[PDB]
Design a protein around this ligand. Structure first.
Ligand SMILES: Cn1cc(C(=O)N2CCc3sccc3C2)ccc1=O
Ligand SMILES: Cn1cc(C(=O)N2CCc3sccc3C2)ccc1=O
Lengths: 354, 354
């Protein structure tokens, strides 16, 4: 029912956005059709975990709070709209990051900019529109809601934290002291910045704010339940689950078959490179430096072989055990003020851990 | 004094943004330096007409309204911050549009993405940060202002109208009925969509909202003076002055020497192409179709020669006379409710017309 309600609200949001373009922005039907296809191609197809977390958090509070049926329906509708603002925000990131990174495929389909009738000229602007649409949704659907100011303020900080994260991510293969707009950026030779703390900073800002913090805090906001939680705990658990999620994506980029990654070629500061450097002997480090960040398949094969013989699964299982420990602890600390919210965080963890 | 105060506030805004990155976003000093150079290169160098209009509108109201000195200083400071949000919004557009259009130069300097240490990978994200910074400024400086909700709501609509305008602009050389993300877009052969009404729609959305409406309405908002005006008149005069401004830029793109344009090669729906088609005979139209939208300098020379022999200066002088007439009329209609605001619009017109 929740997924069914969530997908139904997409149809209503799309019709509202397209009809407003016609009545207020002088759009013609062909341009409305182009934007309709753009919206469907960039916003749909995923699993909707981010958007659905808003719905799941709100449903949790509905079960333990007294409301009229019309209030229950309004809260669910608000959780669905809020969920779609997050999915559209993600769509904005995916379109822009695919252009920035020169990506080829996204969810077994070509990246949006690669469609023949799209091109980078239109796709950069299509990504800008996707983010504008999140604000149009908020100002229209939440016009008279007491949580409107807090929701816009939170969405803004998360979006800015994400833009900051993308900057940390795309400059992670360069020496900080050499960053200069005037001079072409060489790849690092010492890899001195491939450390656990620097990797944690990249991940924290690039994904955790919008993938985990935003859905959980939006669920609280639409429920008028922000008092039922200690915000310092919500932030701590979101960054922690968020970090684990990225570590899984970094492992998959290298080892998950294409049908089911270019982090080595792009010389990314991945969990695999950081972990490898933290345990490798002098000769393994020299061989890593000689092969990393090269498009040559023979060199990518050497890096993968180094990762395979380094037994990084042991470090991953030890990292996983520590995260299980810390997540269980934070969930317990959340149970004090809100057993309902703690259960929502437990579900988020189960969906991440699986 | 006003320019001097405006430029002083840039230093304070830059220090606030960079210091917040350090204390809240874990930025290192090299990344802060990269963003400082990015901000200066993209936001400074222009004439600041957009930002300064906010200041000029507020100064106009200060002269006719009773306030304590501390209130006068706060209003001016608010007009300056609001002015810089517009300049940063423009910077965002210029960075993104230069990447989209493949532009080479911007204000006698290379476009931001073309700097050796920047690249498209960083520049798309730098443009996203420039827009995020406009929201950080608003939420920090206007946190407790009664105009905060209206200002954010207006800024959002203007930004979305601009994104819509960029879409109308980049798709203006294509047949509407052929727009399709699945099929590579051919240039128009009939030029049936190169009409005054279609050209007016492009211009209205791509520049007039952010160049003229936003500065004037922001000046009113920071002054708590939105009642002193008929908003339908403000919109009418902004779109009208805005249209005239773009017509001047379209003429300059073709005839102003590079030291002091690619609209012909990019097959843009410019005022020159629209006006030419509106008066040309059958053989002139055939010669236009045979040469427009081609990078070949011999073909660009034919188009320029057609424009020169078509006596478009006569049509420009007649368009100019009609705009002078309509602007004078709207200024008179504004004088009824606010002689102060009407004088601010008269100054905006004088700076545009010169
Ligand atoms: C590709 N993909 C992604 C996800 C995902 O976006 N996650 C993990 C779980 C949650 S719960 C709240 C947010 C998330 C983030 C889950 C399964 C999957 O196949
Ligand atoms: C390049 N350049 C631009 C401008 C400009 O941005 N305008 C024209 C006047 C006004 S007043 C309020 C907004 C505007 C817009 C003026 C002189 C110039 O050299």
């Amino acid at each position: 029912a929740s997924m069914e309600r969530f997908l139904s609200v997409y149809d209503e949001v799309q019709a509202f956005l397209l009809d407003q373009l016609q009545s207020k922005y002088e759009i013609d039907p062909n341009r409305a059709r182009y934007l309709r296809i753009m919206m469907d191609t960039t916003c749909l197809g995923g699993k909707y975990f981010r958007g659905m977390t808003v719905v799941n958090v709100a449903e949790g509070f509905l079960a333990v709070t007294q409301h009229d049926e019309a209030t229950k329906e309004r809260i669910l509708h608000d959780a669905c709209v809020g969920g779609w603002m997050i999915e559209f925000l993600q769509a904005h990131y995916l379109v822009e990051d695919d252009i920035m990174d020169g990506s080829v495929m996204r969810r077994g389909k070509p990246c949006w900019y690669r469609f023949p009738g799209v091109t980078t000229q239109c796709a950069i602007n299509d990504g800008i529109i996707l983010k504008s649409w999140t604000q149009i949704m908020a100002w229209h659907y939440f016009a008279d809601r007491p949580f409107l100011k807090d929701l816009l303020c939170l969405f803004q900080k998360v979006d800015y934290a994400t833009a900051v994260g993308q900057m940390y991510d795309v400059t992670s293969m360069c020496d900080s002291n050499k960053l200069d707009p005037e001079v072409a950026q060489p790849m690092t030779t010492d890899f001195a910045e491939f450390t656990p703390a620097i990797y944690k900073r990249i991940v924290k800002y690039k994904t955790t704010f919008y993938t985990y913090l935003l859905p959980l805090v939006m669920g609280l906001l639409v429920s008028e339940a922000a008092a039922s939680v200690e915000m310092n705990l919500v932030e701590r658990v979101a960054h922690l689950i968020g970090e684990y999620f990225q570590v899984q994506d970094d492992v998959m980029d290298c080892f998950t078959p294409p049908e089911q990654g270019t982090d080595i070629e792009d010389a990314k500061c991945s969990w695999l490179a950081v972990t490898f450097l933290g345990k490798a002997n002098a000769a393994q480090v020299a061989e890593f430096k000689a092969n990393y960040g090269e498009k040559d398949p023979a060199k990518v094969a050497v890096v993968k072989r180094l990762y395979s013989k380094a037994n990084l699964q042991a470090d991953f299982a030890a990292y996983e055990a520590e995260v299980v420990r810390e997540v269980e602890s934070l969930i317990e600390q959340l149970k004090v003020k809100s057993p309902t919210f703690a259960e929502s965080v437990a579900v988020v963890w189960e969906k991440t851990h699986k």
